């Protein structure tokens, strides 16, 4: 059989497994038949072009559907009272009740309500009309076409890059720092000052008249004469109304700090100076490494020079290890991307940048949950692909006595102390929670163990939170740090001391307990991933694991039993802990913000100290409207979310039987079914081409994990959206 063309051993398989594994190893280019390094790199280049084109097409589709079936031009007239529309509904399976229920947001047909928060983003960046959205969609279509053609071209024989071109770290770093990061940020700052701010102040600026409309009145002379302060004079007053000329200043680069009084979001001019400054810094950074002139650093000598007397060989030979190994680079990139996605979530829920996005609680919750889940997935993938590197691309002799080898030396100490910290957190956190539960249940909630989060409150004070009376640093009015004449200090101190936003929310004993539980989850997931990565090469039970690859089922029932001794199994186990930690995180965030938005912070404050309050006040209480989306009486707009809630519960349940029941049972059952088919008249005329067999052990684990994760995500998303929409939306 032809398929799969990249693996002969799979193509000669006569069973249905050939269909499955061929899918699973399709995009693993290294293990393909007759694969060279150069071909691998070029194929990766083309595939990355493809993913970029897919991203651009997805964004174009978002824009086009919003412009076509949305209410963008009506939404901007009243962002605080109109639900944005995602896309239209066309379902012949609908009934009259569903049609009436889903005709919402002033539409004339069944429509969905957008929760990605793209309306606020488009409004903030200056898009105000449907035709602008349409032009953006068409331009993104053209851009995706260009990138697809670029992939095809650089895949052609005359345009195939050489191996040396791919292994040019210095030139890539210089171009991608100064150009990709710096020039793009500078262009965004120029877009903000030339277009976004004038449109926010009522002046319409487009391609038609942006050449005849200067950003600043006395423009482009002070920048070259050095009198930059002119661009900071006359900022937007506190009475400014977004999108109008009432109370609007003329400054284009400010450091006001805090939030816009009306939109409850960061000042646009602050964003302009911020992106300009980081563009300048990135452009400076991009002139660091030597490419083909005399000046510039070289990464290899920097790495080979930083060696100490305690670590042995230090960072020697690390340049070759990183450059020759693609999995090392992928793991580093995934770790960094996950960290900065977590950063995006944490600094975006507390410092909103888009106008009126702080008042749309549903979109805020959705965005936080989404980007935090993405960050968790990326953080898991970093460790997984690092373990893959250790299995495949790690050379012990080359990286001898350096830090990479030193990691595998005290790996037992690493795992032991990690196990100790995980157990130490878990025991004394579960003990405190159960103690509070038991004490509260016995009718004496006064004997609870409530620890004030003193250190985090001290940090809040050091940033300027004057509620705990710590009187330290920025909270100290006489401290040198608070008497530097910083232009952002008044606005920042005003915003931090206001209780109307999420900027440094007040904390208590429940936040202490839940943050320590999150710490337990993080350390346990790290323990699983790290032990898998370090034991991937081998352990006492399997000294020769590297010979068996990264993912293998087991080594049989002998020598104890094996049963998930591979590093792929470590990743598979760590996915569950990642999901559990993300669940705790999102539960804490959502309940705290429900209390904040309703003004009933005391409910969370006094009910989060014991687990029964979590079970009753959060889960039981907030499901009242969700599960009533469709009743024996009728149907409301939350019907789809109730259906998806049950759907997620069902898929989560279904994953359990790929996770618990194992292969031999189903193999024998399929044997019986095969007998039944072969012995049946009028069905013997039809025969299979691939012999039906049960799913393999690793495939079964993967499928169970997939159903599990899909159910988890769908259930929580449905519950969160339904609860927040019913409460506030």
């Amino acid at each position: 059989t032809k398929f799969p063309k990249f693996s002969q051993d799979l193509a000669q398989d006569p069973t249905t497994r050939r269909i499955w594994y061929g899918i699973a190893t399709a995009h693993d280019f290294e293990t393909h038949d007759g694969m060279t390094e150069e071909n691998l790199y070029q194929k990766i280049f083309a595939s990355h072009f493809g993913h970029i084109a897919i991203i651009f097409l997805w964004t174009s589709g978002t824009l086009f559907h919003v412009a076509w079936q949305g209410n963008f031009e009506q939404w901007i007239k009243d962002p605080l009272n109109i639900r944005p529309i995602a896309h239209a509904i066309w379902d012949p399976h609908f009934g009259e009740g569903a049609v009436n229920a889903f005709t919402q947001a002033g539409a004339s047909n069944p429509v969905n309500i957008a929760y990605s928060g793209v309306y606020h983003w488009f409004y903030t960046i200056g898009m105000t009309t449907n035709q602008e959205l349409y032009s953006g969609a068409v331009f993104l279509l053209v851009l995706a076409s260009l990138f697809l053609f670029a992939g095809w071209l650089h895949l052609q024989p005359k345009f195939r890059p050489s191996l040396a071109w791919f292994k040019n770290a210095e030139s890539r770093l210089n171009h991608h720092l100064a150009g990709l990061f710096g020039v793009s940020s500078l262009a965004w700052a120029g877009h903000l000052v030339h277009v976004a701010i004038p449109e926010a102040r009522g002046q319409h600026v487009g391609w038609d008249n942006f050449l005849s409309t200067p950003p600043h009145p006395a423009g482009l002379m002070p920048f070259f004469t050095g009198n930059w302060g002119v661009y900071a004079a006359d900022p937007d007053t506190a009475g400014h109304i977004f999108g109008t000329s009432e109370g609007a200043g003329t400054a284009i680069l400010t450091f006001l700090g805090g939030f816009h009084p009306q939109t409850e979001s960061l000042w646009l001019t602050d964003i302009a100076h911020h992106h300009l400054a980081i563009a300048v810094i990135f452009i400076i950074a991009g002139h660091m490494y030597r490419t083909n002139w005399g000046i510039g650093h070289s990464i290899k000598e920097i790495l080979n020079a930083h060696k100490g007397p305690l670590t042995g060989a230090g960072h020697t030979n690390l340049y070759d290890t990183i450059n020759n190994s693609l999995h090392f680079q992928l793991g580093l990139a995934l770790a960094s991307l996950g960290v900065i996605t977590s950063l995006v979530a944490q600094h975006m829920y507390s410092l909103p940048s888009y106008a009126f996005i702080a008042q749309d609680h549903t979109t805020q919750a959705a965005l936080y949950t989404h980007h935090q889940y993405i960050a968790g997935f990326l953080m898991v993938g970093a460790f997984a692909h690092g373990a893959i590197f250790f299995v495949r691309d790690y050379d012990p002799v080359a990286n001898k006595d350096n830090v990479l080898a030193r990691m595998l030396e005290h790996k037992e100490a690493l795992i032991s102390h990690l196990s100790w910290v995980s157990l130490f957190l878990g025991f004394h956190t579960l003990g405190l929670y159960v103690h509070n539960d038991v004490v509260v249940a016995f009718g004496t909630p006064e004997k609870q163990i409530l620890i004030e989060p003193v250190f985090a409150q001290w940090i809040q004070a050091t940033s300027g939170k004057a509620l705990y009376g710590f009187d330290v640093l920025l909270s100290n009015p006489d401290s040198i740090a608070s008497t530097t004449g910083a232009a952002w200090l008044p606005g920042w101190l005003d915003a931090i001391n206001s209780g109307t936003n999420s900027l440094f929310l007040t904390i208590g004993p429940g936040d202490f307990l839940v943050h320590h539980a999150i710490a337990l989850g993080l350390h346990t997931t790290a323990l699983i991933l790290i032990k898998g990565a370090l034991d991937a090469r081998g352990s006492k039970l399997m000294p020769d694991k590297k010979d068996f690859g990264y993912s293998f089922p087991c080594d049989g029932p002998g020598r104890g039993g094996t049963c998930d001794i591979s590093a792929w199994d470590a990743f598979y186990l760590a996915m569950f802990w990642m999901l559990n930690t993300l669940g705790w995180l999102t539960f804490y965030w959502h309940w705290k913000h429900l209390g904040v938005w309703s003004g009933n912070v005391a409910q969370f404050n006094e009910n989060s100290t014991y687990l029964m309050g979590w079970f009753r006040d959060y889960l039981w209480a907030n499901s009242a409207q969700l599960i009533n989306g469709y009743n024996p009486y009728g149907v409301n707009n939350l019907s789809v979310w109730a259906w998806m809630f049950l759907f997620g519960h069902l898929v989560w349940a279904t994953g359990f039987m790929f996770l618990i029941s194992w292969r031999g049972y189903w193999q024998e059952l399929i044997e019986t079914i095969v007998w039944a088919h072969e012995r049946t008249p009028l069905a013997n005329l039809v025969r299979w081409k691939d012999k039906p067999v049960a799913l393999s052990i690793v495939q079964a684990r993967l499928v169970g994990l997939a159903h599990f994760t899909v159910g988890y995500v769908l259930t929580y998303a449905a519950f969160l959206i339904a609860s927040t929409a019913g409460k506030f939306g």
């Binding site: 037992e412 352990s539 104890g560 094996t562």
Partner: protein, 75 residues
Amino acid sequence: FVFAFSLMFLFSGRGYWQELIESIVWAHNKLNVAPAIQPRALSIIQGRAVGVAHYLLGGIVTTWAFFLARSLSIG
């Protein structure tokens, strides 16, 4: 709780736990406090039995508490 706890044993295998016990045994050996009875991860059959036992216990206890509370609270 116990139901969820059972998912430790049903969803996992014993090689992971054996390697973890190897690391912990190294830890206890560094301090010369290693036990004479060498610790081992539970067998595959024992793991399945423990998982099913704790699972059934948790589920049945949940149903028992729910039923008794509801039936004593309905007069």
